[model samples]
Target: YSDEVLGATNWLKEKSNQEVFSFVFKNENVQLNGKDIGWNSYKKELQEDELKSLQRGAETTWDQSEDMEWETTVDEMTKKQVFIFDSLVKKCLFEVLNTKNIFPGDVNWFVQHEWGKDQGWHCHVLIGGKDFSQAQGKWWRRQLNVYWSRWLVTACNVQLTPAERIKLREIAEDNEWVTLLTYKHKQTKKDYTKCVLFGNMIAYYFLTKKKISTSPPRDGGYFLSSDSGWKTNFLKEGERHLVSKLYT
Candidate 1:
């Protein structure tokens, strides 16, 4: 579950730059409803409706209603924007978790976006697990590296030698700066191709903090910052030559 939680968190950040603030509860440190529910069991017992409410907003623990302090100095628009940001981040977290098969109890995640004095608007994710290196590494292995050509070779059964693979990849790097992967229609089984732009272009868009459509056939392509577009159009004119170069 922790693996799933961390994996989904990374996915959110990579895809949307949405940060998650996390609180990991140790088996010995937390309780609920007067019972010491261990770290893993909370997901089983907590209703998702209840969990959703928590992620959408913040909580304050105080002795009484009268003891709470409200920040009256903040402007109305700023407060609204902050809350909206919170809602959007939580929504993206839920979407990522669901997509990555992460369940509710494993989630102790939150998100906060702020303007830094030097860095401008950036988000922070406070993770509470024991060590993140392993979690992050696992996620990267599965999700980060695109290796589109490898998939094409395997799925399309292209007879490419190791050296040939390198040659074509270099050709694509210098000439087209993109790679095409083909898929079949579920019912029709018609071959359709799409492109994944170079890692440099993807990284350029990511570091610039600009959003590009990184999902599916819109223009016929997508790109992941590290390894992973739509459209058949990008290489339309040279596609036949490109295919011949690789296939031959």
Candidate 2:
């Protein structure tokens, strides 16, 4: 195997490096196929009536297309934005842990992006407490939201729009979207209530451990490199955020 392939293989082989308890979260914002794609701006062809019929700030379907335009552009932009999103969320959480002084171990995190089979582009992440545990704990989720209001004043991208900003705050401070951060069973059917283990098993499974599609490659799952590691995607052209491990 090529060096890059071998590198990824060796990296995944180590079972001791597994992440313990942590949180998994994802978000999506509506975008237009007309504007999102860098390739060609087709919005220039909008009819006067169609253009004038816009009193709204955002609309899911800006303009219809014959080709797979909307499907492609949305995922691309999601990749770029999420690339930054993971870092911001982690930094916010990491700093909080630092302040609280509860971080005794590292958080092994992986943010993987994919196109919705029929949904928009969104990524998944895992923050671990044990080498093999999941969903680090309340300490992490709480710290992230507490820092959110302070950062919101900076008016980060999500804050510009009232709807998205409000939504972010809600989900940030409150677990409005359930299952993002969950508590697992303690190996008991009746009395296992504390949930010694915490994690999103389904999210962690297909997204990372088992078989990850990485969404779709440039050529729809075809790759030039014989290697399957993340580095193998170096041969990929255009702009795509393949994968990232923020904490570890």
Candidate 3:
């Protein structure tokens, strides 16, 4: 399910040429008139053309191959931009988890993977919340760092600054959260652009998680019960059957 959704999203990103809209709610609250709105509502408010622009931006970011064209120019700036945007996305995720005490399972967060453009990577987060107000402020702030930092450390092995590392620890004790921050440095302009694409792709995963998983986990062993372990047994049976048939 995760791979399918991610695949479809990447397809759309490629189609749009990395021009995805990044809607940021300045205040913690996003209200329409006197009442609070939802994330979907805000998305709906955008005209078709506006949405297309966003898609294009995202697609552009995803195209890492373009970096070769700008190998001599804008390399460092592009790398810095990718890192900045990636960090921002992680911070946003951490904030959301902290404020809601819930892991969203539906929102789609898009970060570009290294593919074609000199722009490096940027972020496109789908703020899926019951209400737009739910996704504003601290939640967004925290989640950005949470998701970005993890990617950095895991993929790049780049140690974050002491201050950044301290801030990450202050948020949550879970190692998964901090481990996601690691990332490798790009050796060339072409590779750096690809890093941007990678950042956007990471954002997509985080955003999707935000949209889904609204509720807490069910009973601890529901999915792992031996009594109802059809998935496990089926796999074992299939493997045995194949081997037996081959031998016989």
Tens digits of lDDT, candidate 1, 72-170: 233333333333333333443445456556664453332223343342222322321222222342232222112222221222123446765464444
lDDT of each: 0.28, 0.34, 0.30
**Tens-place lDDT digits, model 3, residues 137-191:** 3334345545444433233222345654454444333432322221356555321
List residue ranges in candidate 1 displaced over 4 A.
1-71, 127-248
Mark the regions of model 3 whose C-alpha exceeds 4 Å error after superposition.
1-6, 9-22, 25-72, 111-124, 129-248
> Distance (Å) between predicted and true CA of 50, model 1?
11
* Segments in model 2 whose C-alpha atoms lie over 4 Å from true places: 16-19, 28-79, 100-105, 115-121, 129-136, 148-168, 175-248
lDDT of 2: 0.34
> Which is superior by TM-score, 2 or 3?
2
Query: How much does candidate 3 score in TM-score?
Result: 0.26
Candidate topping lDDT:
2
